Amino acid sequence: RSYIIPFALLCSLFFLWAVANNLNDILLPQFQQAFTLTNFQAGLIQSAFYFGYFIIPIPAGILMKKLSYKAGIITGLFLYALGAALFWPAAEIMNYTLFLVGLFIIAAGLGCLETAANPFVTVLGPESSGHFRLNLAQTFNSFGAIIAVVFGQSLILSNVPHQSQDVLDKMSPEQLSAYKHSLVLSVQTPYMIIVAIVLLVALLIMLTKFPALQSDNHSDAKQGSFSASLSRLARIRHWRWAVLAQFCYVGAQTACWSYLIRYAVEEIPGMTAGFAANYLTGTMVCFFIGRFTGTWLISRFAPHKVLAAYALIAMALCLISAFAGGHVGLIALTLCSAFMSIQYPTIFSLGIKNLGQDTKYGSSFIVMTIIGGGIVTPVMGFVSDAAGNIPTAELIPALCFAVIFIFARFRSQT
Ligand SMILES: CCCCCCCCCO[C@@H]1O[C@H](CO)[C@@H](O)[C@H](O)[C@H]1O
């Protein structure tokens, strides 16, 4: 009961934030698609990614071990809004370096929130429902992403100045400066809305009183240490395996979506990349639908069994995708996300549940494996080009899902 209301709030707050955030995702390109283009500095943007999803996690966890989950969530929510707030001004004065800075900051909020919010929800109540809790909250996440794209993308990209790069090319310098500014001007109000949303969320959390948790506690001082927590983590095996599992999931997932439109265009005559995007959309819908249903499953059933089931089906879909072509392989690929759905939350929960003190530090690592999303692309490109076509590369995701299934039948403990 006292575990329940905070939870429902977290869900709504997951949803809400999920809107403010993917809202930020729609607009950020515009800064870039307007001030096009550049070479070296582009790599600097990708670095925010590793920064936030590799560096910040462990420190974040340390913050948490020493303070708590709410502390980490708060600062994470704090980091995000600060970083998001930097954009508008960097734009309005055309200071890139400032933009880049806010980007790293918002990037840290992300790694911070990831490492914070996930273990928190699964611990937010009885041990069994840890998996269902995280999954359901993640559904509200997915759902929030749904909404922004819907009620938001249309009702917000119809106020931003469209421009054929050719017109931009033909502009005088004065004109270009004028354009760029009118552009950053149109987005700056929705950004205030965003930050506003992010803030209120942070607010509600401070207002919200949660019950205590054997994993937030401090009864240790020496053994509460990093390496103490760490040396203990090696055997645990299910944790060490979920780590490997999440690396693969992220690799798998980005392999699928990142290469999807290329697959479509090279596989189906005559696809425009414009039209292919439609399939990409369907994928996110499968993903949300996939999660809703999977969570209904996670409530009825042993999570690992659902995880294992889903891992197999997705791997199937991918083999089908790799060996089929035309529309048959496409649909299989785009339908695959319906089964990726449950995977990340379920992997995460099986992974920690249950680590107690080491829950925090264990999470820091699971988060870092998001680096796998980055490591896969070269391999996708490599295998793809080495083979002459996109589909044979789709064996790689499949290879991931396979591994993940092994974990599912290897999630066990005690
Ligand atoms: C009131 C508390 C609000 C806390 C919200 C924590 C959100 C954690 C969600 O994980 C993130 O979701 C993104 C999509 O929304 C993904 O793209 C990204 O990979 C992942 O890192």
Task: Mark whether 217 and 302 lie in a shared domain.
Answer: no
Structure tokens at 169: 């090319």
- Indicate the angle between helix axes 359-368 and 238-267, nearest 10 degrees: 20
Place of tokens 């294992």: 308
What distance separates the 2 farthest-apart alpha carbons in the chain? Answer: 70
Dihedral of the CA atoms 39, 40, 44, 46 (nearest 10)?
A: 50
Q: Which of 157, 188, 222 is the last residue of a domain?
A: 222
147 lines ligand 1 (CB under 6 A): no
Give the residue from 398, 403, 286, 400 showing the smallest Cα distance to 342.
286
CA 111 to chain CA mean position, Å:
10
Residue indicated by tokens 């990409």: 280
**Inter-residue contact 403 to 244 (CB < 8 Å):** yes
Query: Do 176 and 234 have their domain in common?
Result: no
Structure tokens, 66:
């020493």
Number of domains the chain contains? 2
Of ligand 1's listed atoms, the one at least distance from the Cα of 114 is 8
Q: Is 125 left (phi over 0), alpha (psi -120 to 50) or beta?
A: left
Does residue 121 share a domain with residue 215?
yes
Q: Tokens in use for 267?
A: 């596989």
* Nearest ligand 1 atom, CA 113: 6
Cis geometry, peptide bond prior to residue 371 (ω within 30 degrees of 0):
no
Q: Whose CA is nearest to atom 4 of ligand 1?
A: 14
Alpha-carbon distance 46 to 208, whole Å?
A: 35
Could you tell which of 16, 21, 207, 344 is best to mutate to test the pocket of ligand 1, judged by most ligand atoms within 8 Å of the CB?
A: 21
Domain check: are 248 and 362 in the same one? Answer: yes
For residues 188 and 17, the answer to whether their CB atoms sit within 8 Å is no
311 Cβ contact list (under 8 Å, min separation 6): 339, 343, 401, 402, 404, 405, 408
Whether the CB of 18 sits within 6 Å of ligand 1: yes
Rounded CA-CA distance 195/81 in Å is 6
Angle subtended by helix axes 96-123 and 130-147, to nearest 10: 140
Domain span holding position 279 = 223-414
Residues 196 and 271 in one domain: no
The residue written with tokens 């809107």 in the block is 19
**Would you call 218 exposed, middle or buried from its count of C-beta atoms within 10 A (0-12, 13-18, 19+)?**
exposed
> Which of these three, 203, 222, 241, is where a domain ends?
222
- Pocket of ligand 1 contains residue 117 by CB under 6 Å: yes
Cβ-based neighbours of 284, under 8 Å, separated by 6 or more: 145, 146, 149, 337
Please give the Cα distance from 359 to 268 (Å, whole number). Answer: 47
Give the per-residue SS3 of the chain: CCCHHHHHHHHHHHHHHHHHHHHHHHHHHHHHHHCCCCCHHHHHHHHHHHHHHHHCHHHHHHHHHHCCHHHHHHHHHHHHHHHHHHHHHHHHCCCHHHHHHHHHHHHHHHHHHHHHHHHHHHHCCCCCCHHHHHHHHHHHHHHHHHHHHHHHHHHHHCCCCCCCHHHHHHCCHHHHHHHHHHHHHHHHHHHHHHHHHHHHHHHHHHHCCCCCCCCCCCCCCCCCCHHHHHHHHECECHHHHHHHHHHHHHHHHHHHHHHHHHHHHHHCCCCCHHHHHHHHHHHHHHHHHHHHHHHHHHHHCCHHHHHHHHHHHHHHHHHHHHHCCHHHHHHHHHHHHHHHCCHHHHHHHHHHCCCHHHHHHHHHHHHHHHHHHHHHHHHHHHHHHHHCCCHHHHHHHHHHHHHHHHHHCCCCCC
Q: Which of 19, 78, 122, 141 to mutate to test the pocket of ligand 1 (most atoms within 8 A of CB)?
A: 141
Nearest to residue 356, comparing CAs of 210, 211, 212, 216? 216
Task: Report the candidate in 69, 199, 57 with the shortest Cα–Cα distance to residue 121.
Answer: 69
Tell me if 321 CB under 6 Å of ligand 1. no
The residue type of 330 is L
Domain boundary among 222, 247, 279: 222
List the structure tokens of 310: 């889903």
How many CB atoms neighbour CB 223 within 10 A? 10
Residues 199 and 254 in one domain: no
Q: How far is the CA of 227 from the centre of ligand 1 (A)?
A: 28
What does the alpha-carbon distance between residue 289 and residue 342 come to, in Å, rounded to a whole number? 10
- Under 8 Å between Cβ of 410 and 241: yes
Q: How far is the C-alpha of 122 from the C-alpha of 133, rounded, in Å?
A: 6
**CA distances in angstroms from 109 to 81, 271, 333, listed in the order given:** 8, 38, 32
Q: What's the reported resolution, in angstroms, to a tenth?
A: 3.1
**Whole-angstrom distance, CA of residue 181 vs CA of residue 39:** 22
